[model samples]
Target: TGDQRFGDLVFRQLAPNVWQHTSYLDMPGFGAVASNGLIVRDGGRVLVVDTAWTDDQTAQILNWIKQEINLPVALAVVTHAHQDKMGGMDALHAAGIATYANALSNQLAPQEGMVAAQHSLTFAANGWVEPATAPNFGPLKVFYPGPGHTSDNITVGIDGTDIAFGGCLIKDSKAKSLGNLGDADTEHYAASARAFGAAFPKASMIVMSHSAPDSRAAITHTARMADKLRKL
Candidate 1:
């Protein structure tokens, strides 16, 4: 149970061999929004999911891994193209870390001024990425689960653990409403969320981008809101 703070960025052990990192991003009308990601250790290497809001914050995560965790980052994957997820691409590239994103995410990244992922993760039918596509991402399973918060949104599940990173696709219990619908699929949002829940039914600890980790019920909560949005 260790909690380390690198300035405003905080990293805490959520489970054995799995560390959760939280970073803040100042957004209009939202004040300072907190984003979450995961640091997974396996096969004597580190695999990171998502990045902080800026290159500096992301670099700090890399430094902490190097100095404290004492493991080389083998791969980095951004859940989507948003700044909260992929703004630190330069930092990852500078560190020479292998970076990957879903094919759709890499295509949409440049519109946000973020660099495309060094490699593409192709999804098979139903947004499932075949294991052969990412052999080094040990214990990390990637799923697109269709589009909800954004068209390119994806979720990551740590195999053998009841932990899943839902990114912006899943909201926390405190979320009164779906935060952003700028690029959302209002009609299919609920279905997409349900897909996520189905994809990780055993996921008890579901981590979201904008708030604290919550139980899988948050997925249901989000889907309910999505269902409501379709009527509007």
Candidate 2:
């Protein structure tokens, strides 16, 4: 029962080594919307997949890590170029923490006039060309399945654990339609999601950038939506 809420930011344990954190974004269309990221632990090292919407929230999570995990944050990875994912990069950098993302995201983030992370992993045609076979801050594999929520959207999965941080690419059960599509590629989203699911056939808990961890069903839902969009 790892439940920690700091103001609008919240953290809930999805598995032994995986925790999901939610933050709120006040988008014009959707006020007070929820966005999520993951906090993964691999032995002594700890990594936060994404930050809450602001610096304050990120600082709080960092404090919680120091108090609860008793380990310093080894790194933070912004899965995409969206602000919901990399908004708190300035805070992480200020805290002397290394941040990571795929190469495309790394290039686009700064171009968007947004702060970029310190480190970046190269993403090839399929996924990561660099080997990440084992856990560092936790069992992790960074891959770019395809375009979906955003062109640079990537999946951060934990080895031997049913944890796939699919970010905004995967939808939630309550999502009637694609929640937000200002940056989504509906066509490739489903196929990307299907391929991502196939890569992790045994995933017990699939985490999304928004909404609850609805296992792999979330991917199916996104696929159905994408297919419908393709038809019309």
Candidate 3:
């Protein structure tokens, strides 16, 4: 079993080449408080997904990576522009690691009203810091799945493994609500869920940043939850 205290936050192998780091804060009053990251082994390099919430936490994670594998991470993908997702970017960047996020996030992060507020709070608490500059990870073939959760949210699909790193687009079983629709367009979120469902219908597994590995059932459940929100 993974570590109990942060069991939800422990690294779990979702597939042959994919793993997820689910954060310790997975309860209520702790909503939007979980830190999720991914590790993808491709070729001879390991690609890290989002960095955790604090520099210390990110350091521990990087240390764990060192203990587990010898291949240096080729890149780190910040799923979106949110503080929880990209707060430790500076830590990664400082380590000489390359980081990537949605191009739209790069254009909007600096100006995003919601993100600005959160970023400020994290910065004040020393829980967050931005990367020196935006980084890219090749062409990222998948189209904009939807403007859900946030307009800049994007999913990265692993070529050989039918695994998709779905940022905040889909939540794990622990996530009961539709999600933080605060900065999202509900209508667009629903449309995006549908688009994702249809686009990767053959995806064997879906790795959400906040939750655990999900099957097709989980995807359907998320879509239903989004639909339920539309009715509210």
Most accurate candidate by TM-score: 1
RMSD of 3: 7.6
lDDT head-to-head 2 vs 3, winner? 2
Clash pairs, model 2 backbone: 42-137, 42-138
Candidate 1, TM-score vs. the true structure? 0.95
Model 2 reaches what TM-score against the true structure?
A: 0.91
What local lDDT score does residue 83 receive in model 1, on the 0 to 100 scale? 90
Clash pairs detected, candidate 3: 9-22
The TM-score values for the models, in the order shown, are 0.95, 0.91, 0.77
Clashing pairs in 1: none
Comparing 1 with 3 on TM-score, the higher-scoring candidate is 1
Which ranges in model 3 have alpha carbons more than 4 Å from their true place? 1-9, 25-32, 111-143, 173-175
Candidate 3, 92-169: lDDT as tens digits: 866777766656676676775212212111011211123333223332334357678888776666666777666788
Measured by lDDT, the strongest candidate is: 1
Score residue 35 of candidate 1 by CA lDDT.
84
In the range 125-226, model 2's lDDT, one tens digit per residue, is 566536552124346778788888788888878887877877888887568987778888877878988878876778778888877888677888888888
In terms of lDDT, the poorest run of 10 residues in model 2 is 129-138
